[PDB]
Amino acid sequence: PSPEEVQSWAQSFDKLMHSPAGRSVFRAFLRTEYSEENMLFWLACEELKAEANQHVVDEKARLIYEDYVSILSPKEVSLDSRVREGINKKMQEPSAHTFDDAQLQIYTLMHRDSYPRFLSSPTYRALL
């Protein structure tokens, strides 16, 4: 929580996701703009990598395809296109890298829509 996490996260993005306190401040600022669901969408996607098993890989795969692609609330991650078909075709016999295309597209939305304002958001200048 020192000006290092602040000066460090402003020079590179990895340091922001490769640390517990980073994923935290980002989880809060986003909550304001009502853009936190995408946050979990990243952990749930990068969580399936600590498995790559086979039996649990299927149950969990549904939680992701169910909690979003199916239906649940207006908080549906902004996504739906050529990828909606690739996920439905790859859904059979999934793997620890099926959302690699979806999880990527989103990580880009936060980097492009949240980084320009986060670098100047009070949540980050509030500790500066």
**CATH number, domain 1-33+114-127:** 1.10.196.10
| Cα–Cα dist 3/89, whole Å | 46
- Tell me the CA end-to-end span of the chain in Å, nearest whole number: 10
Residue 48, exposed/middle/buried by CB under 10 A (0-12, 13-18, 19+)?
buried
| CATH 1.10.167.10 residue window(s) in the chain | 34-113
| Cα–Cα dist 99/97, whole Å | 6
**CATH number, domain 34-113:** 1.10.167.10
Q: Please name which of 48, 47, 30 lies closest in space to residue 39, comparing C-alpha atoms.
A: 30
| Cα–Cα dist 123/63, whole Å | 31
Burial letters 14-31, b for 16+ CB under 10 A, else e: eebeeeeebeebbeebbe
